[PDB]
Design a protein around this ligand. Structure first.
Ligand SMILES: Nc1ncnc2c1ncn2[C@@H]1O[C@H](COP(=O)(O)O)[C@@H](O)[C@H]1O
Ligand SMILES: Nc1ncnc2c1ncn2[C@@H]1O[C@H](COP(=O)(O)O)[C@@H](O)[C@H]1O
Lengths: 277, 277
């Protein structure tokens, strides 16, 4: 078994090393928490880590991995940040370690993967679910944390876990926002100051919608569309109101409003809870 | 937690019930063994059960489930037999319990699934791997047992376990045969006495090949083909020599010879280890 130093950051890149350390720790009664990321960490990621850390005695495992793009699809102080959060395990595998036999067996999501973010990127969620399934098997966490920021991803992870009978609790963590409401994202770094200012329209549109919703679903959608239309440098890709599981919105109930929009070349996403009437 | 009576047969049909009992038993140090079947049990299945039982203190879980056919694909004393073998858990889920949300997330095998048995049934191994992945997650066995009888299936399960980082040992169990060499199978029950007699040709052809192989790969294939051609009521679907992982056979080394053949309407399979020269 590789060395593990409790109460310090321990970095592993081989799946077998994390699997052995995780198994040994879980046997002592320390619950293991998994927080999957693509690195370039910010306060949105740190909220997931802090939620994992709230679990007494937990070993928090944060993975950093950028899954390769499949055919036809286009597209640092991380460890220091994790250490300062009291994360004990960082898992940083190479592509070759994750895929030693290439892309062979994979996960095929259900049809929700072709909707919304799957429209522009029809293979994206197959990659996500394949990687998350692997991380779950390597780490064997008690709980795994995903942000509401990627709501469709979170819903699909719930489907993965239900459909494959996975014995992990999926924990969704609320979106972390800047003071003006802009959802935090590493992509925000691509925005120039004017685009950053204009980008507040996404959260402004969704929050306006969530309040407009006392007057019903159409009022909510129309309020959001009006705010986005008022922002000249924001080009909307989609703005959709769905039920909480991303099926069709019901006449009366809880739903989710999702937007994707481009500021110049940068595509941003946001979503919010909606209660109808 | 559902009742569990040690040293007796316990039957569960709900995934959650087996998952809770398995988790509780594993915590006591009893290792859990999983033997997946489609019921209609015979001595070939019992060999898998006996191999599982050899593991001291093991709880043997035998699942009985017939996975539904996907679109475009065509096609009792089981519990008493398991009880007499000292099996403590039989898991007998309905289709609805296995697929409460229908066929949604599934496993997509690698390209070996389209070869050999996947030729006639291109969706068959996706169903197999999906079901086995679910059974593995429900039961969380230390080891899972598959017969060499279904060699391509066994190879694909090894791929599933490697590619998804599954923390289970896959145990292949040698094929159980009748006294004359016919590989045991529930399908043998479909054969009339004359067809049963003729069916010995499959094992005769493979065993002849395994001995002919001192003279090389072509000699081995030709010996097998000659035996099959000598049996007038046996129609060969395929006869292929491959490496042990079912890639192309190497010039010198270990391989596997696989045959599929029809006697009237009944399709039978057999395979054997081959050592080249
Ligand atoms: N602003 C945010 N608030 C909450 N979660 C976030 C935020 N940004 C990213 N995440 C979550 O962090 C995880 C890793 O994101 P990524 O590194 O973008 O794969 C995913 O579960 C995201 O949904
Ligand atoms: N004659 C046999 N010898 C060894 N294993 C067998 C035999 N017949 C069936 N099996 C194994 O029993 C398991 C269940 O088979 P089935 O019930 O046909 O799905 C599979 O792993 C088969 O490969």
């Amino acid at each position: 078994i590789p060395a593990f130093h409790p109460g310090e950051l321990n970095v592993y890149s081989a799946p077998g090393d994390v699997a052995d350390v995780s198994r040994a720790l879980r046997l002592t009664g320390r619950r293991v928490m998994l927080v999957p990321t693509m690195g370039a960490l910010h306060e949105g990621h740190l909220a997931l880590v802090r939620a994992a850390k709230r679990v007494p005695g937990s070993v928090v495992v944060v993975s950093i991995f950028v899954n390769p793009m499949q055919f036809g699809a286009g597209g640092d102080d991380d460890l220091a940040q994790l250490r300062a959060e009291g994360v004990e395990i960082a898992f940083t595998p190479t592509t070759a370690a994750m895929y030693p036999d290439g892309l062979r067996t994979t996960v095929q999501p259900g049809p929700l993967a072709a909707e919304l973010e799957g429209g522009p990127r029809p293979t994206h969620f197959a990659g996500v679910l394949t990687v998350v399934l692997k991380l779950l098997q390597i780490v064997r966490p008690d709980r795994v944390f995903f942000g509401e920021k990627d709501y469709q991803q979170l819903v699909l992870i719930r489907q993965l876990v239900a459909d494959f009978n996975l014995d992990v609790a999926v924990v969704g963590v609320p979106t972390v926002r800047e003071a003006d409401g802009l959802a935090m994202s590493s992509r925000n770094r691509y925005l120039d100051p004017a685009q950053r200012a204009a980008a507040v329209a996404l959260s402004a549109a969704l929050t306006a919608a969530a309040h407009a919703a006392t007057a019903g679903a159409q009022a909510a959608l129309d309020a959001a569309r009006a705010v986005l239309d008022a922002a000249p440098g924001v080009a909307v890709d989609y703005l959709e109101l769905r039920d909480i599981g991303l099926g069709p919105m019901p006449l009366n109930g809880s739903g989710r409003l999702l937007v994707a929009a481009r500021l110049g070349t940068t595509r941003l996403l946001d979503n919010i809870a909606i209660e109808i009437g």
